From a paper:
Rhomboids are evolutionarily conserved serine proteases that cleave transmembrane proteins within the membrane. Rhomboids are a family of intramembrane proteases that use a catalytic dyad of serine and histidine for proteolysis of TM substrates. Here, we describe structures of the Escherichia coli rhomboid GlpG in complex with β-lactam inhibitors. The inhibitors form a single bond to the catalytic serine and the carbonyl oxygen of the inhibitor faces away from the oxyanion hole.
Residue numbers in the entry: 92 to 247, 250 to 271
Write the structure that this text describes.
Amino acid sequence: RAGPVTWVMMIACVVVFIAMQILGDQEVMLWLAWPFDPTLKFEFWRYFTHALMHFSLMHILFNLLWWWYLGGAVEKRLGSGKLIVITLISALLSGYVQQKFSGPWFGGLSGVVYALMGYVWLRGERDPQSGIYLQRGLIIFALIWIVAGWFDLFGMANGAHIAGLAVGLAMAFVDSLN
Ligand SMILES: *C(=O)C[C@@H](NC(=O)Oc1ccccc1)c1ccccc1
Ligand SMILES: [Cl-]
Ligand SMILES: [Cl-]
């Protein structure tokens, strides 16, 4: 079963998403979003908490599905610390790129997922002995989501997703060295 990081992240995302139903998107964004005024630049959770917000049912459902599967695999085979670091860095870098290109009003686990699939894929592609790999059907399911978001077929930006992917590829690369 899904490890503690995999589990606690899912719960947090659910709780936050409930809060957004109860209070509206904007009001929750007022507290958790990337600093959107210099008044807020020292509220440090915000460099991370933006990842916890989702705006539709499908957003949180698909994000959490991929998180549960990939994140859960990473936690189980490579440990909780690994998953924590991939998450922290991908969240920060994709958040950074996103706000740079389009301002601070955004949310979600997408950057983190791009990192996890970049990680699992490259890791297995370069080092099967690790035990982790993105099997063919999932490489296909994954690419279809990459394509979708890329050409804006679902409504959700590219640069931030690339930024997330770069983090996962970078860490898989490093991890698969000796
Ligand atoms: C974030 O990108 C939202 C997006 N989630 C998604 O694309 O997840 C994946 C899956 C596989 C590889 C990369 C990213 C999304 C779009 C539309 C509906 C739900 C979620
Ligand atoms: Cl398969
Ligand atoms: Cl490792």
